[PDB]
Amino acid sequence: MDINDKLSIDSPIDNKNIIEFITFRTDTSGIQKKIKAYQIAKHIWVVPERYYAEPLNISDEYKIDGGIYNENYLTTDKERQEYLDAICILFKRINNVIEGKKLLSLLSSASPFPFKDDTNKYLLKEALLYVNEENFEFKFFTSNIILFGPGTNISKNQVLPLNGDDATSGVGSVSEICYNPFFTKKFGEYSLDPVIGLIECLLKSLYNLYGIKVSDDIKIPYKLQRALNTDKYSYINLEEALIFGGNDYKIFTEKPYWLSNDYFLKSLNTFEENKAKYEKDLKNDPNLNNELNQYLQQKYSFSISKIWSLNLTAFADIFNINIPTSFLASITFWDRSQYYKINYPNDYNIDGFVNGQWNTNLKNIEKDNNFIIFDKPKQIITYINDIFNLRYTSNLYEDNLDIESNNYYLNFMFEYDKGNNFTINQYKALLDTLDNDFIDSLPPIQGMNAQNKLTSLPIISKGTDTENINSELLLPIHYLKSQTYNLDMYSSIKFTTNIYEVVSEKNSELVYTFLPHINEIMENYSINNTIKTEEEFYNWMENLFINYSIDILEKRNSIIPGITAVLPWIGKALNILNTNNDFEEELQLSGIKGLIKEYENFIIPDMIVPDIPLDNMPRTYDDIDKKLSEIYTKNKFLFLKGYYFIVQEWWTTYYIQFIELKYLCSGAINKQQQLLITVLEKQLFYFTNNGLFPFDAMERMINEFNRSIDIFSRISQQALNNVDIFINECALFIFNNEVYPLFLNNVENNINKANDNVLNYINKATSLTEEQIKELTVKYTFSSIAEVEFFNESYFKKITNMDIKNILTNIKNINNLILSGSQINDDITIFDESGNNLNIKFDPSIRIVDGHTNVAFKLDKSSQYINIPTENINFSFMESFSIDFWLKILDSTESTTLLNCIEDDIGWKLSIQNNNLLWEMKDNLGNNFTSLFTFNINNIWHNITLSIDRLTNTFNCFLDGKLINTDNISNIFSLETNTPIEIQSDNGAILLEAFSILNYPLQQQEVLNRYREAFSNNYTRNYYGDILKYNENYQLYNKTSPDKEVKKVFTNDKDYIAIEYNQNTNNPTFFSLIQKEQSKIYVEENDEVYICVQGDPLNYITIDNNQAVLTKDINLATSFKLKTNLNKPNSLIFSENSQALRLSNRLNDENYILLDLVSKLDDEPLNIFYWEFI
């Protein structure tokens, strides 16, 4: 059984599963010391001590950029306990999901080949001999992996295999892991999940256990090296690339493969005979095997093709962690190395970070006594200007991946005999073929001997030191430094647009901004007297948000092909294409290539295989059709490996330069944000430090400014998304018409070549078929240029879209809600259609019934409710929103509630007050605003949409697409509250439908559009607004006499229908529509229908001299074509040809119904021709 989780604490005992062993290699002193470990799981051990082998400290020369190297760490029992607790927490979290516990099951039975002369197994630690008594009791405790603490470098989590020789040959190795979970990086405004750091160590160890390691020699191009004046590539290890999957792993693992480097064949081939030997030698059950058959039967049952599919990014998807899938191994190193301590008991539980990945708010590891973050920035660049004394230094940071030249692309060899392998119908999910329960059920190994061939692994690699290179122009990194503020809190800030001002003094209070509106605001702003009341502080904050929103979100539609729109601020932020010319126009003249350093030594593959052999082989239609088919398809494959080859090269040469711009734009935004929060932050501190405002008022401004931070970050993310799209377009554009056209020209030449090759292959031995070649020709003409083409622009979007997503915040679109619903069985569902704020609650007692053009929720009972949380629904004074829905009041109710979003008498609610809508909303400051719509909702479908525009401070209310109040809301500030939006009647029965809350404040024009779209089905409606139904009886009225009902008159020596006055009986006359054919349930516009008057004989409606007399025969009925007009939507027209029904002038207390030619008034006929059903 899995989820073992000993959960052991301290040192209660040192017996049974708790053992004390001797270290494999020697300590730094040069001696092996005894130590104790704890068994977390079957064959899995932990030891909460720093790595014995690695020194507790090293010289400054040997320190790596972004290490810790603190010696007084994990040198106490409480730290050892903290680490122990940290491990079981992480392993429980691994056991939390199904895939995680499948890996741990595999690890428990992934013992390397236990080869023996009837004695031992593979490498392993020793049991205590009872040397306490100096006894010599020998025993071996099984251990597939051993988890140590951090070694010399705390930041480094490396998996050291105790013998690399057998860890490559396929024998395997029980590797030792030195992993530290307490510190993680950010990469943005979110914290990296420690399980990724530990899962990666487990996967690396699993390769060692299976003996499938790449021997450190097999490397792949990952990315063009980040510098100025280098043009080499930074090569990544294949094993790392397999694990750090992301989008870099999808581009080379498509269905047609690449040079396997023999590894994907060597390892598979080595696996074949390793599987073969077990079944024919070890499965013969030698008596000294000690039940290792089952572990080996399960270990060899799993295919390595499934271990390779285990990438580190799909695991992040399983735990639902956000991770930079673009360049996972490198993108985390492109800035100063900063670590944040994780308090595992508190800040990280079985379900990941407690406070979510963004808002966990950990503390920087910077502390005086211990923990020095040794940072050596590769390529410290200092801008130099001899126009005037100006020297502006900036630090660059790069990954620690080793670098090679452009060889891979130059001397890449396509092996023409690489036909498709594996790729059976079945291979596209994780952990498909293994046993969880069966592996778990197997007892552990507790009795046999163990070998020890400790291959030394002391490959010390003192790294490169920094280079101090000058520069003649202001780099983006220089601009980014200008954006940052590096001073006290108790010191002023000065904004400017002249970058040259800031560079003059390195850490002057002055900071550069590329946002004109923001600079204008800060031109006249003193922390002393500009803001003097709470209300003014809020307003200034609102004013900043507005101006900030306007500057960064600015985009214009582009005339460049392949680009929808262009961000004109990118010029002023990173100093790229930043001339006196407009950025739009500079991009025109300079082109898209102006955004990238063009790589001259770009390699385009040649892809020529004209080899066509000849002979007389007469088998299987002389194997001609087959031979040319397999040749045609191999040429298709060869060209496809070339297209795949050219995509990888474009990725690692040209996209890297684009994702890098994404990184640069990312900061540039955040930076400006940081400035805007800081200028606000200093202002708040100015109040507090000088006393000034009281606690109640102070606490509110603090509370509101804290809230506002994520609101800056909301539109900040929105800016990056505009960048994401803009850059991707540019990235695909470079490939589209600068790499692809050159690659197509090679294929076109090879097409005509291979075409001519097959034409030159006419081995027409003995008698020949002159005609048949031309049939063979069309098959293998190679005319299918498009068929061989695999340029699905979708593919490039799939790899480059949201590749670094939610850097600023996880928060999606806000104030977005549609709230539809569906039925299943007798059961219902209610969800956000837009898929935002999906944590909805409701009782299933609610019935879903047809309404106006939709399905409506029937809130009958008071107990019934719909409860919509406000997790991403902001109602701060800086947030404008609107609410839109359709409502019908089922029963005559004077006073009921509909909506409610109020907590402690703060928030907003909508309710019914004496058949009148009552909208009130009141804020935290005690400013109330209330509005009473007195249009007297009377049991009729109504479109209630009402918009709160926080820009102009206007509250608009539209009913049925028509604006009413348009009051001013200026006196009303933030009414954000935690309580959800509640929808319950409380006093009445209502029908609610199409309940939408919108991110922006609607206007008259757009509201009217929304109202009109609700009629686009062209259904006829009764008076109440409900859609008219066939074979349903109604009362007929002329819309001109609401009070008087159309009533039949029978046995008058003429039977007809007419409106009677002084009725006083109003003998209910019920009419129903019926159609001769295609009998439906819902009555659409423009349908042929007859009118049935309910009566004992059940007579129908016909025409006699244009009168509407009642016949009794239905073949004697008249056909009316129903026409509806939007202006009167609860009204019908019974038109035959170009005459419609009309009411006559009063004659004998009776108004007769007759057909009259329709007379209109600007497309809109008289009120008479319109009829209503009830």
Numbering used by the authors: 1 to 1174
Q: What did the authors write?
A:
NTNH/X was also stable at high protein concentration (over 40 mg/ml). Although the electron density map was not well defined for many side chains, we were able to build the complete main chain, including regions missing in the cryo-EM model. The overall structure of NTNH/X in the free state is very similar to that in the BoNT/X-NTNH/X complex, exhibiting the same domain organization with only a slight difference in the angle between the nLC-nHN portion and the nHC domain. The structures of the individual subdomains of NTNH/X only differ between the free and toxin-bound states locally, in certain loop regions involved either in the toxin-NTNH interface or in crystal contacts. The high stability, relative rigidity, and domain arrangement of NTNH/X support its function as a structural scaffold for BoNT/X. However, NTNH/X has an extended loop with exposed hydrophobic residues, structurally close to the NTNHA nLoop. This loop (NTNH/X residues 128–138) could not be built in the cryo-EM model of the complex, but was built in the X-ray model of free NTNH/X where it extends into the solvent. Although not conserved in other orfX-type NTNH proteins, its position suggests a potential interaction site with other proteins.
All BoNTs are naturally co-expressed with a protective partner protein (NTNH) with which they form a 300 kDa complex, to resist acidic and proteolytic attack from the digestive tract. We have previously identified a new botulinum neurotoxin serotype, BoNT/X, that has unique and therapeutically attractive properties. We present the cryo-EM structure of the BoNT/X-NTNH/X complex and the crystal structure of the isolated NTNH protein.
